Design a protein around this nucleic acid. Sequence first.
RNA 1: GAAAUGAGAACAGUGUAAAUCUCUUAGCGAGGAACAAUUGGAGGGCAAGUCAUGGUGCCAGCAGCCGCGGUAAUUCCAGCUCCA
Lengths: 99, 74, 140, 229, 180
Amino acid sequence: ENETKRELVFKEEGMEYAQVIKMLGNGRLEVFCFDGKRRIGHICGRLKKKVWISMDDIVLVGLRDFQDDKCDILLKYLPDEVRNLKQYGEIDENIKIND
Amino acid sequence: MGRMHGTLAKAGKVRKQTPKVEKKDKPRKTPKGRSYKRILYNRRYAPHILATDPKKRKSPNWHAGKKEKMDAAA
Amino acid sequence: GVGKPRGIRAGRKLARHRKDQRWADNDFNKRLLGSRWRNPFMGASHAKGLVTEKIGIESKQPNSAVRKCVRVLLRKNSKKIAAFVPMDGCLNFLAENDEVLVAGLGRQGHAVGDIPGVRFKVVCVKGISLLALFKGKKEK
Amino acid sequence: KNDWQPQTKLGRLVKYGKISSLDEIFKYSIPIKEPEIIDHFYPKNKDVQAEHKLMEEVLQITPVQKQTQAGQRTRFKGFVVVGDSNGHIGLGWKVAKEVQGAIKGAITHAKLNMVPVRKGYWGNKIANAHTIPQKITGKSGSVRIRLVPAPRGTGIVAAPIPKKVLQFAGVQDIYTSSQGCTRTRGNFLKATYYALANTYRYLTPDFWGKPEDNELPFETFSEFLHTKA
Amino acid sequence: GKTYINTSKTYSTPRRPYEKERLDNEMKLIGTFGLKNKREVWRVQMILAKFRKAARELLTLDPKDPRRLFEGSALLRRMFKYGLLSEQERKLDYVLGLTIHKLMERRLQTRVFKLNLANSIHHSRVLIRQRHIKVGKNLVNVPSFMVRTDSEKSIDFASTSPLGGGREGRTKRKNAKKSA
RNA sequence: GAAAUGAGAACAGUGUAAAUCUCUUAGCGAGGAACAAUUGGAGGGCAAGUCAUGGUGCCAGCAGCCGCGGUAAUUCCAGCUCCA
Ligand SMILES: [Mg+2]
Ligand SMILES: [Mg+2]
Ligand SMILES: [Mg+2]
Ligand SMILES: [Mg+2]
Ligand SMILES: [Mg+2]
Ligand SMILES: [Mg+2]
Ligand SMILES: [Mg+2]
Ligand SMILES: [Mg+2]
Ligand SMILES: [Mg+2]
Ligand SMILES: [Mg+2]
């Protein structure tokens, strides 16, 4: 089971990798960023439609210049995209991915 | 929904992206003043237009493009 | 019947009765007690302020976008105000701590459209217009 | 089958060129059900200068919904005004599942609904009755319209809709007042129409004397009708 | 600065900014009387309106009333001199019936053109702005001049300009003064 | 195709306590991005697109209100056109 293979997308400049910490509501969440900062993310109008996100998922996060404290949830990684990220050496090898 | 390139929420995004297209250089010019309202009266409220079926009267902007000005003149 | 006196000596009761019931009309109420003067503009048309923060504001349902905004410190009031920044990438024309000119959004004290609760817009930056700047007539 | 075969006694009386004028029908208060009788008095030979040119206008077209056996079934309503600018006006409306259908049926309806507006004088009585004899009132649903007579050349002071009706009636000069929910276009139209109709209902002082006593067309023309065609 | 000169407003703006029937009528007016600029028709409307308020107030009044007699007389005398009213209608009621179509027809443009002095309702409006026409003892450079029935006699070209026997203008001069 | 003329600019004359401007007037001053009007709008309210227009793809943004934008946008950014 999976949605069609598409290229694992990396953190471009202005984005950061993140892991979901707790659930807020209104389509919001607290994320731990591999920037090293906690932020409060909002979920994309795109993602609100397609991909349901939950706790401890690994997500890509589009950042904001002005408010660093808020960030936008961009895309969710499939656990395989994640293990691949670890392979590539983008995100640290000690991280908990749950199924 | 796997197509993403730019950061979401960047400030000038759509305006910056838009190609710069230059305004066409006009042969001659648009008459200012009374003469303009003359022009309008002509192409709109003039006798020949009135003579035609008021329910079949053709709406002022119907043509964007010139191919239908060619179809209008024929 | 009609619950209302008709009589020629009834004049004052009539007029007093109105001088009372008139208070239920809102614009009258808000007018009559100073309400205007206490608002962040102090009755005024526009105001100048300083920019504390550039802030994004997530739009009301059912719309999603990030409304570019600023929190301004009004120079007359020293009250803090949350104001919207119009058109496209105009949030860029703003630097933190500039002089900024701010007006109502057209609902006279209330928020418009999808931006929740935000009652003000940005008009001028330093000395110049956001319009002047947008269309690129002048430079900051 | 472009030839009209009358199904009404009145229809026969009209087609065969017997009842003189339209207003006469109105006078003897003969019900018009046949939307032919009306096209009769308004000839389609098309001479552009007559003020007796009969006019039709679609006013409303509404997508009406129904919830039926798990489906949502749409039809169209339409409102139509018919009038010669000289004294005569009608209003009609029809529901059908095809638009041009609603329109045709509503035109027909409006014709069946023809009514004689009365035209009065504001001030000194000189030439063309430019307005109504009295102030009167249309009532439809919540809505109310009051028509008050205006001096010469005041023109029609009234909302887009009742204005359109009034122009069709040929009231040149008038003052309007409206109560109720006026955005309900059918009620607004209806009101204006009924109002315009009440002009002849009002007994003004000039109507006070003994009227003429005539025999109904049907009694006079009885011989004609009982021939077998 | 204290100053006692009086305030004016020549026109008025419609309750309803966009309505087809009205806009169309206004453009038929602008078309036929060769105006520019809707407010011209609006100020004509204003003028007519003034006339009508007058007639109305006077019709409030008793027919015997001194005021209606004098001021009514004055209003109609005022019509003739402008030829807004025909000989036969001297009754106040006919004032109300005044058309903007009649009143615009009293324009100096409308007059010059219809006098075969100009080829076009437009030709006119330049001409009387070109300083090419005299009315009465003056030279009228204004299109909006309402025409005295009496001065309709003397409308001819300026003795100043060509068409008046005056020197041919700078154009003909500069063309002709360059030989071969 | 030549006529017409003011904006401009000037001798003079008018005007002023003087100066300026007006007004009257010689010598001058019109064929094209010049002597070239804008400011707001084309979904409804509300006049004006039935662009097989390009960009963006719920982003940037629009929207007084209803709403438009999630890949064929009548609503954003633009070009053309059209309206007030
Ligand atoms: Mg109120
Ligand atoms: Mg407002
Ligand atoms: Mg809402
Ligand atoms: Mg521009
Ligand atoms: Mg009302
Ligand atoms: Mg001098
Ligand atoms: Mg030129
Ligand atoms: Mg716009
Ligand atoms: Mg497109
Ligand atoms: Mg556009």
